Symmetry: C3
Subunit: 495 residues, 3 copies
């Protein structure tokens, strides 16, 4: 959404993909042990990547909606299913007038690779409805998200075993609660797992802890996994830890709000927030809760008391971490050289262009790629789907057993020691640390979503770092991610 650096979104991801695929093409051919080796392996690798790139299924919908004034409006909509190498497909629904089959094809291709980076067992899919939800009433929105769902279900583009959606820009809990309900009510009344047909749902309708803040929490973790690796902080020329540093977020939505929230909590200082109508600034810090508070009461952030209204690209604030948490293609050729930050935390899906990437590369700015950084969402989504399939709130059946097993464990160590040091020690009590006391009943659902997220973010950071160093990609972390993703997906097509 720019001027003279606005590449076709799908091809822009194909561009990233194609790059990380030459980095491994040698590795893939060497891997494949096919008896007809040769270039008849080089090419059967060439064939396989050629099948991965294009979305397998796209469905373009035109369906009518009775507006609230009575009039009829033909509402446009698409869901692309990138890959089935794992079913079901996974990916959000976006309500925007930028929605096009190519944008939605791209977000789709971005989603399989996002799930490969964090080893989430879904092929990618994405959906968009070409509307601007500020122009519609809640009742209209409901009328839309439901009719969109009925069309998806009858053509096989939603369903717990075939394709599971999620939230995105201008969608969220509410519209997730609608989709779930119209599918379960119609196409899947007999389907035991009907409410696993979409993620992002309200806690009470089958959703999971922290799903709303999930993408932003995972954003904090991806940054932490690098903000603390001195290997890179050296190459950057700045010091480890969050306690030093300063950041600005583009976008105050589910991603941005929660990206701010957590970075602030662990010490970092938010100097600048912006949305589609302006940006505010104050190097002394902006408290996410006051900002949020103000945002909720005023429909905008502009004119926040404890900050100035910043004239100028927030992308170009003076800060250490810039977090694009709005939409795509916001860091482009023309404005990359003015970025002033050292780290670009890609909250959003593909907010930086290939050619901004190259500016950042040689300008020694670390772009942490969307592929990995915003996969907090699908992770905690996958957890939500898994919650649905399992039909049990994590911990429920085992809390009392482990609280029990653990005192009996602890009591074993007590008794053993008292058996030996009869009265020299006397009564050796063996009791939980405050922190083991919290852990003592086993993981709760909240427990699993935080730790399982961390585990994923730290592990997928690692195999990005291990892969970045194995190929000397330096700060080009993006293509390192597409290397692991291309790697894993090819494996499925391979065997």
């Amino acid at each position: 959404a720019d001027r003279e650096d606005d590449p076709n979104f799908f091809k822009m991801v194909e561009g990233f993909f194609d790059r990380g695929a030459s980095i491994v093409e040698d590795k893939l051919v060497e891997d494949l042990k096919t008896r007809e080796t040769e270039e008849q392996k080089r090419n059967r690798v060439r064939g396989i990547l050629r099948i991965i790139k294009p979305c397998n299924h796209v469905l373009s919908l035109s369906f009518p909606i009775r507006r609230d004034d009575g009039s009829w409006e033909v509402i446009e909509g698409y869901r692309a299913q990138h890959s089935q190498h794992r079913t079901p497909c996974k990916g959000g629904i976006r309500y925007s007038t930028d929605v096009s089959v190519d944008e939605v094809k791209a977000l789709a291709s971005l989603m399989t690779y996002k799930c490969a980076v964090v080893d989430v067992p879904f092929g990618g899919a994405k959906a968009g409805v070409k509307i601007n939800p500020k122009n519609y009433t809640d009742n209209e929105l409901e009328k839309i998200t439901r009719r969109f769902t009925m069309e998806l279900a009858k053509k096989g583009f939603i369903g717990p075993g075939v394709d599971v959606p999620a939230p995105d820009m201008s969608t969220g809990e509410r519209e997730m609660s609608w989709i779930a309900d119209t599918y379960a009510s119609t196409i899947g009344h007999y389907d035991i797992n009907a409410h696993a047909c979409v993620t992002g749902k309200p806690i009470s309708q089958g959703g999971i802890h922290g799903r709303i803040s999930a993408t932003g929490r995972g954003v904090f973790h991806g940054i932490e996994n690098f903000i603390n690796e001195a290997s890179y902080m050296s190459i950057l020329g700045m010091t480890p830890g969050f306690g030093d540093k300063t950041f600005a977020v583009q976008g105050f939505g589910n991603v941005g709000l929660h990206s701010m929230r957590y970075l602030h909590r662990f010490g970092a200082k938010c100097v600048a927030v912006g949305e589609s109508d302006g940006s505010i600034w104050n190097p002394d810090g902006i408290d996410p809760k006051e900002l949020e508070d103000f945002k909720l009461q005023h429909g905008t952030i502009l004119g926040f008391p404890k900050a100035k209204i910043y004239e100028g690209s927030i992308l170009e604030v003076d800060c250490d971490i810039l977090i694009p948490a709005a939409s795509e293609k916001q860091l482009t050729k023309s404005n990359a050289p003015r970025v002033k930050a050292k780290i670009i935390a890609e909250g959003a899906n593909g907010p930086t262009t290939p050619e901004a990437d190259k500016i950042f590369l040689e300008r020694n700015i670390m772009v942490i790629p969307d592929l990995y950084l915003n996969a907090g969402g699908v992770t905690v989504s996958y957890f939500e789907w898994l919650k649905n399939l399992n039909h049990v709130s994590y911990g429920r059946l085992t809390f009392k057993y482990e609280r029990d097993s653990n005192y009996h464990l602890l009591m074993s160590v007590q008794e053993s020691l008292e058996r030996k040091f009869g009265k020299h020690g006397g009564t050796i009590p063996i009791v939980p640390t405050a922190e083991f006391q919290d852990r003592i009943s086993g993981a709760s659902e909240k427990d699993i979503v935080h730790s399982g997220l961390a585990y994923t973010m730290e592990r997928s950071a690692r195999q990005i770092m291990r892969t970045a160093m194995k190929y000397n990609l330096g700060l080009d972390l993006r293509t390192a991610a597409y290397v692991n993703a291309i790697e894993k997906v090819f494996r499925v097509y391979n065997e």
Copy 2:
């Protein structure tokens, strides 16, 4: 029975609901953050509350049977589903002549509120067939069970993801076995979950441990949690603990007997048991096992040696704990004044009417409401359903692994204690407690049923107790319960 206090079962439970519905009314109202405020909320609340109360679907059957002698007899039956706010619906099949669409309706609703109290994710449901089983041969009872399953199946009132029935009065393992068999042999031949279609099954047919005795056991756990609470035991004027307590039991069925078994087990003296033809009595104690033996032997509890035949309402026996475990509407305004017991443990479904509830409160008899006490049934039926869904005996895959790990964990405390106390300590064997040795391979199925039930019946007892004290219901435990059932259900309907 009772002819002057025979309220229509559905409206009666509707009453209990409404009551609890009022005390939350201000709470629910202030919770919901709807922007359109003031009293558009208060309507919203009794608007949602007005959808909860009525049953969504009720299915009336008339189907023919060929009796043994060769005649044709027509059997009528019903199944009511009260909610789908949780899929599937859960609820028993009862075979009595009292069955009417209405009692099946009230029973179903009761099941919805029940599962809410007890955090089981099922909407309530219930069936009934208008036969006295006693009057049919085993072969006939089979035909009736099967054809009634086919009717429920075709019209979609049974199925693992729609509606999982279960036992009730005059049905047990045997019948569920036939239900599960004709379902899975016809409609379910393809369902990987065909045997999750019903619960209460023979363990050999998909059942779970202790599902027969599970509602009895949950009765005990429910009584215990209060009887061991000094706050209520002061108010009630009785000693904490089961040691000094005497109790009587109306009904000697699945929940009748096993309630006796577990209460007798932990120290309570069962002085009297009743059935549909009379009661027996002995304030020196009746042993469940001897009584069970005699009953299976002579089809009647009457004429049991070690206890006299008690002339009169066993409900009115002198005792600590009165446990209705028969049909509904047995403690009424007629006989509520002269009950004698200080704790009513509603093992049966809706056994004390609201008129009695009133007397009991200002008499300061404590009523543990069926809502919370007999949920030990679904809770294990929920476990059985979960067992079927997972297709593994709990523990099977982890027994050895957990056995080994605890051993190496224990070993690490040892090798570390010796690493410090070189030889003044010597060799310090760290060994499992006899009880941690039982708990060393991890929880078996049995362990999950026992412990999961215990956790459940207490976690729910606490938030009942907490809600009694927050709204000063004192001993109106039922009203706190519905207050919690409502609060949890309402949360679904609006969010």
Copy 3:
């Protein structure tokens, strides 16, 4: 093919089953509660058994294939399903020219009793296709197994909850991956468990760790569980353990190879390998990894540098353990007199005829029977089917949480101890041993596969031993197995 002791495979297996039944007939009768005592107790038992013996269903197939050369070829095939007392049926697919309806029938019956022995909740089934796989192309072997999958799909002889096939002779990962796909391509396109329709799948395609290796790994465990019971090695006249031991293996396929791997890993010297074009032999040891490389490089074992072409029945090689791991009816009345080994571990399916079983009995030769010994297969098959159902890799969500739990757990022992022993201890570190360090995150998938298998095999080993002694069967391990399989399947037969 033995020209004087070739019983019809099905009847032969019926004999083993008959044998065991008359042993527990008195047992089944006495347990049977039945009011109708007497011998109408005996006759229901024998009627039920009369139901268990015959296969419930057999599908015979004729379907044409157009060969690579463009000619038309009528491929015959079979699937028999023997029991549904557990759904789905389980059992391998076999490609051979021996595949007859009677052979397929026998193998399927062998599956139901096999899973009964190892407590794998599957009725048994088996399919063959009457082809020499050596005589067809990869392309032709795909058209065949794909069309066979379609024939099996459309008549209900494959489906994740109806009948889950798996590998067997001349089938493997590559065929399973086709079955799985062909099924999930078509019929199962909406099935959330389409990929659980078959086991043996590649790991990237829903397979499980070590399932190729699973069966012989259980052959190892099953031998191990017997080779270490002094009671049985006494009777035998051999030393406990693998230390000094020596074995020959008929068959070098998926059972033969890994049986030979694992036995070799834990001591034993493999002295003969054999296939269908001959045997090799070397008393001083055949290293399995060597023989694999040579096999893989030469498509045969004959002329393996480190052994001599053995001439003469591999079944009569001098060794401690003879392992038939090929086809059935290898050890027959003609050559059983000449077998020389003391433990016959039946990794194959039905390798030993009944007349040869008799000879082995009175020769004091312990045949560890197929029924139990090669059930490592289904068990790990079971594990993968569950893997597919649970849609999560084992441990994924709990690793990080368990790590921190154990560290705080130990940290609790540390600080508790330091609180007592102020400075007379000083700093009392408590750390994981090396072994508990490996388990400190919880069980990985392979962890479960390895310990789950081992658990299953030791437990099943025991209940066979337990049965043998109680029935004074001594070395008739087979009848002990059938006696458990009959016991277990019966008792499901309750209405």
